Design an enzyme around this catalytic site. Structure first.
Site, PDB file in Angstrom:
ATOM      1  N   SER A  50       0.839  -1.187   0.000  1.00  0.00           N
ATOM      2  CA  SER A  50       0.000   0.000   0.000  1.00  0.00           C
ATOM      3  C   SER A  50       0.882   1.248   0.000  1.00  0.00           C
ATOM      4  CB  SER A  50      -0.955  -0.006   1.197  1.00  0.00           C
ATOM      5  OG  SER A  50      -0.245   0.103   2.420  1.00  0.00           O
ATOM      6  N   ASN A  59      -3.741   6.107   3.673  1.00  0.00           N
ATOM      7  CA  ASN A  59      -3.262   4.850   3.107  1.00  0.00           C
ATOM      8  C   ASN A  59      -4.263   4.241   2.129  1.00  0.00           C
ATOM      9  OD1 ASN A  59      -2.997   1.563   3.676  1.00  0.00           O
ATOM     10  ND2 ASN A  59      -1.022   2.614   3.547  1.00  0.00           N
ATOM     11  N   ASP A 101     -13.520   6.439  12.625  1.00  0.00           N
ATOM     12  CA  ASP A 101     -13.550   4.990  12.411  1.00  0.00           C
ATOM     13  C   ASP A 101     -13.574   4.198  13.714  1.00  0.00           C
ATOM     14  OD1 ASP A 101     -13.302   2.738  10.400  1.00  0.00           O
ATOM     15  OD2 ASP A 101     -11.434   2.369  11.493  1.00  0.00           O
TER      16      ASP A 101
END
Ligand code: CL
Ligand code: CL
Ligand code: CL
Ligand code: CL
Ligand code: CL
Ligand code: NA
Length: 129
Positions: A50, A59, A101
């Site tokens: 990534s 990311n 999140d």
């Protein structure tokens, strides 16, 4: 674009990051400092393939599409290239999703290791905001 410290603070505030999810503006400026040195064009390749993009080094495994991170998601619904723009809108909007999140700003390991618990207000001191 390489932002100045107070320039980035003001842009982040204009885009609604000050106290977003309870994180004061200095936290965001500190995170950007150690993620990218305020350079929107910063990129970094990770061992897993990534890539991290932009002022907050977001990311490609979860957050943006770069076409070269197998099995990944694009939860911010943007090309990773949008995170390199001189206009920080895409980075800010995606960071708002990341910080919501569940783990707050701990999602940015550099924030946890270098900003968390420090006098982050120093990062906005002197700035006209
Ligand atoms: Cl600085
Ligand atoms: Cl602050
Ligand atoms: Cl991909
Ligand atoms: Cl795309
Ligand atoms: Cl939190
Ligand atoms: Na992706």
């Amino acid at each position: 674009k390489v932002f100045g410290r107070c320039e980035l603070a003001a842009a982040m505030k204009r885009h609604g990051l000050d106290n977003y999810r309870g994180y004061s503006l200095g936290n965001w400026v500190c995170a950007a400092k150690f993620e990218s040195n305020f350079n929107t064009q910063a990129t970094n390749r990770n061992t897993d393939g990534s890539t991290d993009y932009g002022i907050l080094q977001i990311n490609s495994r979860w957050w943006c599409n770069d076409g070269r991170t197998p099995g990944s998601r694009n939860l911010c619904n943007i090309p990773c290239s949008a995170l390199l723009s001189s206009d920080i809108t895409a980075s800010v909007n995606c960071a708002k999703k990341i910080v919501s999140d569940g783990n707050g700003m701990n999602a940015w390991v550099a924030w946890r290791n270098r900003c968390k618990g420090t006098d982050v207000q120093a990062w906005i001191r002197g700035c006209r905001l």
